[PDB]
Amino acid sequence: PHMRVRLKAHYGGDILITSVDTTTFQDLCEEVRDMCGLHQQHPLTLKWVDSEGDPCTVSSQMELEEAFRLACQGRDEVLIIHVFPSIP
Amino acid sequence: LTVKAYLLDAAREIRRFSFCPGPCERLLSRVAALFPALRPGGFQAHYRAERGDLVAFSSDEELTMAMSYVKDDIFRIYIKEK
């Protein structure tokens, strides 16, 4: 059903990476904010790139769920999620 | 029932979801709930014909019309903002 998520945060010129092992959209957001030393409310944009190489924005559990489904279909082992904190 | 929704010239935001109280109404409500910048009545749905051309659908009719035209195993949607 769900699989490991590789969190890649593009922030302050760095590429910060952690893994997170069900998985909810909110937990991913909290993990990114903790990793980047961000305020609880720091707006984020999360995207996963699909089989056609399109970045697909996920801003909900439903979208995360669809990325998981499509990741299982592809027999992938980790779901890569790219994350872009907003720049004030 | 696999949907890939392109918000539009080129693609500006892409959102993917599953989808099986009208069909067209349920789908447009799915699209309105999933795209933050979208609110109901504020957008136009489209699909692509085999020739490539964009074409607006706006009813259950034009919706099954659109579906026949989608053979990928993936239903593609193209949204313009009014």
Least CB–CB distance from A62: residue in B2, B13, B17: B17
Quote the radius of gyration of chain A (alpha carbons, Å).
12
Element (H, E) at A5: strand A4-11
To the nearest whole Å, the CA of A15 is away from the closest chain B CA by 22
Contact A66 B16 (CB under 8 A): yes
Take residue A58 and report the two structure tokens written for it.
């996920």
For A60-81, the DSSP string reads SHHHHHHHHHHHHHTT-SEEEE
Total of domains in chain B: 1
Which CA distances in Å does B9 have to B5, B43, B54, B55?
A: 15, 15, 11, 14
Q: Which domain does B29 fall in, by range?
A: 1-82
Other beta carbons within 10 Å of B21: 5
Question: Token digits for A40?
Answer: 């609880």
Give the domain CATH number at B61: 3.10.20.90
CA-wise closest residue to A63 among A82, A47, A40: A47
Phi, psi (rounded to 5 degrees) for A61: -65, -40
Give contacts of B4 with chain A, Cβ < 8 Å.
Answer: 50, 54, 56
Q: What's the Cα-to-Cα distance from B17 to each of A5, A33, A79, B70, B77, rounded to whole Å?
A: 19, 26, 16, 16, 11
Closest C-alpha to A16, from A1, A3, A6? A6
Residue A44's Cα: distance from chain center in Å?
Answer: 10
Distance CA A23, CA B67 (A): 32
Q: Supply φ then ψ for residue A82, to 5 degrees.
A: -85, 135
Sign of CA dihedral B67, B5, B27, B73: positive
Q: Resolution in angstroms, to 1 decimal, for this deposition?
A: 2.5
DSSP assignments along B8-67, one per residue? -----EEEEEE----HHHHHHHHHHHH-TT--TTSEE-EEE-TTS-EEE--SHHHHHHHH
Method: X-ray
* Domains of chain A, CATH where assigned: 1-88 (3.10.20.90)
Residue with token string 């799915």: B30
Close Cβ partners of A11 (under 8 Å, ≥ 6 residues apart): A36, A83, A84, A85
